[PDB]
Write a protein that binds this DNA or RNA. Sequence first.
DNA 1: GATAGCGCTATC
DNA 2: TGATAGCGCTATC
Length: 327
Amino acid sequence: MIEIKDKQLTGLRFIDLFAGLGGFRLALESCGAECVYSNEWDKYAQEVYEMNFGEKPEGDITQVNEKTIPDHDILCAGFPCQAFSISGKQKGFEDSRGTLFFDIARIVREKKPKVVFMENVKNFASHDNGNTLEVVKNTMNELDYSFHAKVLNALDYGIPQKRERIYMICFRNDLNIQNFQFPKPFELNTFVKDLLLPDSEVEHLVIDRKDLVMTNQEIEQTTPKTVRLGIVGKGGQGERIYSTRGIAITLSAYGGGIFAKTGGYLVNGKTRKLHPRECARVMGYPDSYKVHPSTSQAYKQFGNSVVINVLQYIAYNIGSSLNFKPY
DNA sequence: GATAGCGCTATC
DNA sequence: TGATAGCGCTATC
Ligand SMILES: Nc1ncnc2c1ncn2[C@@H]1O[C@H](CSCC[C@H](N)C(=O)O)[C@@H](O)[C@H]1O
């Protein structure tokens, strides 16, 4: 994550829905905002969240009375994506976990915040011939909000990871906000190698498999893209090996394969998956952030989380627009 | 709860 | 295309 000198959200309160690790909180608080409520139902996530922020998020949002939610200016929500991701069954709203957006919609109806800040995977944008994104657009447009939606790739914002996500920013219409803009991409000068831990600390992650097959020579020059070097087994998800000179593939939450949830990398002649700390770094989390004691849950947590830096630039731009009120 | 082989969709 | 990559699925212990 980045240092923010000009706090654009000072004095504003926000809600951290589907909190997970608290990525949205880190991003918004770094801009000067105050979190007044958090919600997350996974026991392990609640444990890490509490370990880092001192509070336990409230449980199952589907059974929380919206009138109970504290007044706030900004609603944050990286809602579930299993139902829309290119990696899943794409059941959408018909999935037991694909209707969470409507829980957001009904919170917005009751609390009517100044801004609604949501996040989800890239495929959400095209899922079901684009009908799902339109349902969200109309739902917000009808709750009386504008709808700014764009797909940003983390590699365009200082973080070496090919994580493409759709970011949705909605302003209450009375706040005639007509100058919101998504952050402008800039050159990437940090790569996977720059974030790795010393070999002594990751020896246990090294995998040596007879069916390891290198298909491409290691690259000498850093590039802002993923570069596959080899594969293990059939080369399905989590069986692919990349160059640390390029960028990291998308970390996942339920991912399988020998290099489950992080993918494999060629480091000093050895192939290994990333350490939870490196995942934290690949996601833009500061080293001060405490990871969960269960490595598997830690990978899962960072897996469906958000890249803090991207959130920061957007959050900064949200406050910039909110603060431009000339006479 | 942790581990890992998979198998199919989206993109150009 | 043909090659690549995905906040996933889920069987087993
Ligand atoms: N009904 C429900 N109530 C509360 N949390 C829920 C929920 N259904 C799903 N979730 C939570 O939705 C989250 C989606 S992942 C969002 C990650 C988050 N922005 C971060 O930075 O970590 C998961 O952590 C999941 O446990």
